[PDB]
């Protein structure tokens, strides 16, 4: 029924929620604009993107944020006639600080206006949101030790939060230390039977990622570990396909079947390469995957073993699949840039990003490069296959070379490549392909340009993945196509090849403009393609 | 008659501007909040701050720029009635490209409230308005190259400013390469007897930074070298006090005299040291100095050889020196901090900084780490000599480690070090040493920590610094000191040791109050103590 | 009955040989001289060293070996009345080559004059020779492939020796592959029942290691691979005192039963850390094991799962104990130097290391620096414990810094540590520490060095390990100690700790004397002591 991973491409962290009989997962979003992704369910195999709720700057203000900043796991619930979603903005990334701010907005509805956030702490990141029976609310997150002679991953830090106060009250406690497998993190809470059930991520979240369970009869512990925890885990299973399984989370279906969301990470192919060396490259960054769970002796159990199953079989309900929520060709005819499009921070107003002043057409005012953490010109979509094509037309006729205009494919600010039209003193409007690597910038078909003839108006741009290896391609016409003599490295736009390891985001294909002079330069976009191959 | 530096500690890229017999200074000042310092001169010896014109967020937003981003080199100048400051919002430091936004704004009076920006362009920094005899306007700054097969420094470009139009009108224009030293910037144009005189930074604002002026009868050049270039430089004096003699600036004074302003580095003793290995390093950062100029066949000369002399003639005026502009033990009585004080990046509001909380004490609410770019609670002044000490006395009560308060000496979010008081689960509140360097983290008291009594309502924080090296001591009574047992470096808090090259400002020295739990604990600083020894 | 390891500290790459109901384990050396160890038993329980057999420089001649080069996994087997002895001299131990000849030397006893080397090949290390029951000579070892795209273990590649002849014959044919854990190596072949068993370890000599067999009718294969294999490792359980499990070796015993001999890492005490972070740091580098075995199905099966034990059951003999081989004070009496002493790289004459210059002494006459690959005056014995200590007196007059002699902690020429007796401008004759990590050096006690009073003879040095942490200590009359004021971190010294990933040998701990200036001063030893806890 069921087939893993059932959110792919970049959506970790994922976070269930139950209302009666419609499933809710949301997904971090990190330095990506607008926050957060909601996807709903029926039968938790079809999913479909319903919410965007961080879309206001009073809500989330990333502008500088860095690279796998901002938006972390975040936690979505239920209870007394709204949702309730926690999220955090993380602004300090690396070092030993983890600088970051916890915020708690409410809906009505899982679409409509959310809240203004009410602040909560700042003692660590993946904050949570338990309703209790009694009607009392509780915080729980990970707690942040700076220290040099310590770990930093503290434990689980509770605190009551009064609803009517807006505002956490009495006093934090440590409730839960962790297992020897540390980085403890991701903490969720249940009531099932007598028991107060804690969840936590344990082991990071790399390839010894493991979803730890602990129980106890005191909301404050102790708590006792699972007797044959990990409860998942892909650490002793280098040769499954779905690696890096951990931070879930549980739900309790109306049909009294119980699952478990969790992020997943799936390599590249690696024949040849010794196994367990280096355990791969995920340039579809952590993707969203869900497991049956069996009870014995008041535990619960992953059904197939403590390793995440590629196919489950789905809850006892009806198939509820879903149209399709974009088009393979999107000629920007519309009056809003379609959800699967993000922006890097910001949101980008009518004088950045617009599709008002031509019709038909996506234009992008050319603002920074592509390695500014501050205002870009660049509009993009999730590679969500291994296998696929993404393709745009565009018409740009830039007058200094600190203009261009291209499709880029993009992990961070100092990781990325591109095909763009520039300007050349010599040569005049060029085609050019240009890579950044951890900030070092290469340009491969230097001196041997493509000049673009003064009567094409519009140059086409496609990129083909295949798995481990992309190559960029281009056109005068729209029919006939030539190949940059050039192969590109998928594993290059990876979480893996990140030497800074806050890398917790995932690849991205898009339209960017630059204009470097400031002469508000812009190019007209008349369509974007991405079409699974 | 007048000893250099005429500005001592971080006052780079010294803008000067006559009005009548007034002589006014305007320093670039990067991340530090307000943006640009602007001093007061009628003898040009003695020098009072008068301006921090970039106060409002709606001028200057730097939140979670790079550090040494922000505010580069300004241009100050009078026409018109009013004054015109023009500066740069730079947005990235390091790489290919230097991502950045030139402005403009004006007041009628130097200390008053100057305008609102009016965007220029972005094409590369140091840019400077040029006021023709005509009445038409001029702008010129450095452009760009962001190529790997080029060299960054394009030359000097130019293009008419509409004062009407509030925007640059025509086509922008390159009108000098530069000379062989190359890294040409700091443009400046003077129109004297017949020509359009062009003076340039070169070099790089290391130790081959120079100062290079060249001629034309036509504003758009071609522009002819002086015939002795450099017109200023320190490179071949490896023995001059005076280090890095470049990015000058040009008055005639009212006396019919000439001189030439320019930025320098003062190195630390290095006695024992290979002369011309490595030519020092300076935590005082760049200083401003004042040289005497002299004309010969149309052509200005640096009185005393192109290098910087150590003391000049001032000019034939009387001299006015000014009384001291801050108390050496600030109590904090004013309803404002002394304006030595800055903060990193942003304003901060009642809500982390206040005079009014707590009567003759500055409060600080706690915010993020010393390694954020985001939002500190830190109040810091310029080291301004090679030998001080610094002192502060503060009531703090940490419930956690994750809140902190200290003195701290610091050049960067990656570059500082404190003596702070936090708490310890054992120990409780304590008083420790943390330094960073180049974002590692050391705590040289492990495990040594000194317990604070309970009884203890204020714990004095001292530091001494004598040139190469400086100490920390304290006391809990104000009387009875005790030195902890590390000495400390300058020469980690100095420009030429930050491996990034993007190292432009200086060390500061000041108080922080950290709250990484998020619970809004605050630090009372009865008085900060700067005097030099 | 036996507990592992069975020899402790850097005891690498067993190699194990049965004659008769005698038992020998021969293991690598690498830069330490003389080559080779070989330890006798009767029991496998109790063992003895009988022989160093490399000890002529026609044999081995190390001088300027880089660290962890020379002598690497010997095997050793008896066939035809002698002794056989394959060995190889790495030459290259970083980058796509591993440059190094293998050799065999033969002697009809364990402890005589060993033959004149027998060049065989250089097709990659890990050489070992299987003697058919048919009479004939095989030699396999590793194949290395230094290509830019490819993984450098080849396989195993298989070769017909003549004795006659003095050389391999017949055509060289790879046999085996590997798995998929790679980076096959240490072959050796067993004919047991109807197959030929091949041995290899796989997943490289760090936490990945495992021992990897296969079987087949014929010498060639194909190799079908052991259905559950590995055979042995450590990598799935990572709660195993004994870590790196692999390179083993098969022994069939007189009475019938079968065991596995194999190298370990025991890693320092981690509480607190992540269980799979990082698996931790062994300073007594890789010593050797033994498992006991089990047939099933015409497999071999490590007893206890296939994850090392500590504790096993050794075969059905008497045991033989062995009376201890080196005094705890060793008073420097006896004619030669005590068996667990070794030099590096190159044998030490009397001009440089002697017990007969001045009686009850070791006198060495001082020659190069601790990071010389070629003539240190330095006689070092094992860390075989994790808590010791060791101790030392020396008598020495040093007239310059380039002058000292000491107590040193050694791991390669990169990484030591030692308290030392030196020469000051001032202060004379003085005692300092001195720290060497990755070629950066350090002074501990700069500028408070231990004066060394004109009338002190001898000076008493001791070094104290307590497991992940040592302290060294003084005295100048043997019965009253000062600790040095600083704490030493023995995770420094560990195989794991070393950058360059060519780091296979262990801690050592010993006496040096240099003499920078060439004026052949020396230093008199009166004594050395180890001693256990
Ligand atoms: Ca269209
Ligand atoms: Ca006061
Ligand atoms: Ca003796």
Not at 412 to 436: D, P
């Amino acid at each position: 029924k069921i087939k893993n991973p059932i959110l792919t491409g970049f959506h970790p962290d994922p976070s269930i929620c139950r209302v009666g009989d419609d499933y809710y997962i949301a997904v971090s979003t990190f330095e990506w604009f607008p926050g957060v992704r909601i996807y709903h369910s029926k039968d938790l195999k079809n999913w479909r993107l319903v919410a965007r709720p961080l879309n206001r700057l009073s809500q989330l203000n990333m502008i500088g944020n860095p690279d796998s900043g901002g938006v972390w796991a975040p936690h979505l619930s239920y209870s007394d006639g709204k949702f309730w979603l926690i999220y955090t903005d993380v602004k300090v990334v690396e070092g030993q600080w983890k600088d970051g701010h916890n915020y708690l907005v409410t809906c009505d509805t899982i679409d409509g206006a959310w809240s203004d956030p009410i602040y909560l702490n700042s003692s660590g990141f993946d904050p949570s949101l338990f309703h209790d029976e009694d009607g009392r609310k509780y915080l729980v997150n990970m707690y942040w030790d700076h220290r040099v002679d310590h770990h930093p991953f503290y434990g689980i830090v509770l605190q009551e939060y009064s609803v009517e106060q807006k505002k956490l009250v009495g006093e934090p406690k440590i409730i839960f230390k962790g297992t020897d497998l540390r980085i403890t993190e991701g903490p969720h809470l249940y009531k099932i039977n007598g028991y107060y059930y804690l969840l936590t991520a344990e082991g990071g979240t790399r390839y010894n990622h493991a979803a730890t369970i602990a129980r106890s009869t005191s909301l404050y512990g102790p708590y006792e570990v699972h007797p044959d925890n990990p409860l998942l885990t892909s650490w002793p299973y280098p040769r499954n396909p779905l690696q890096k399984a951990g931070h879930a989370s549980i739900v309790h279906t109306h049909t009294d079947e119980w699952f478990l969301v969790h992020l997943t990470g799936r390599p590249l192919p690696r024949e040849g390469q010794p196994l367990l060396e280096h355990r791969g490259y995920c340039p579809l960054g952590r993707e969203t995957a869900i497991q049956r769970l069996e009870w014995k002796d008041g535990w619960p159990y992953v059904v197939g073993g403590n390793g995440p199953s590629l196919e489950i079989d789905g809850p006892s309900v009806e198939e509820v699949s879903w149209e399709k929520d974009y088009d393979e060709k999107d000629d920007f005819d519309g009056d809003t840039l379609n959800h699967h499009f993000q922006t890097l921070r910001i949101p980008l107003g009518e004088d950045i990003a617009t599709l008002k002043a031509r019709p038909g057409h996506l234009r992008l005012y050319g603002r920074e490069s592509l390695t500014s953490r501050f205002t870009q010109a660049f509009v993009a979509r999730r590679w969500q296959h291994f296998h696929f094509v993404a393709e745009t037309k565009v018409s740009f006729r830039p007058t200094t070379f600190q203009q261009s205009a291209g499709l880029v494919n993009y992990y961070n600010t100092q990781n990325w490549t591109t095909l763009q039209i520039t300007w050349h003193e010599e040569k005049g409007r060029i085609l050019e392909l240009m890579t950044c690597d951890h900030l070092v910038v290469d340009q491969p078909l230097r001196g041997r340009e493509i000049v673009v003839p003064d009567d094409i108006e519009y140059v086409y741009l496609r990129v083909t993945v295949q798995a481990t290896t992309y190559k960029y391609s281009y056109s005068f016409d729209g029919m006939n196509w030539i190949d940059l003599p050039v192969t590109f490295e998928s594993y290059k736009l990876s979480d893996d090849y990140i030497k800074s390891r806050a890398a917790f985001t995932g690849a991205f294909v898009g339209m960017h403009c630059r204009d470097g002079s400031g002469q508000n330069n812009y190019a007209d976009f008349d369509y974007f393609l991405y079409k699974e191959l």
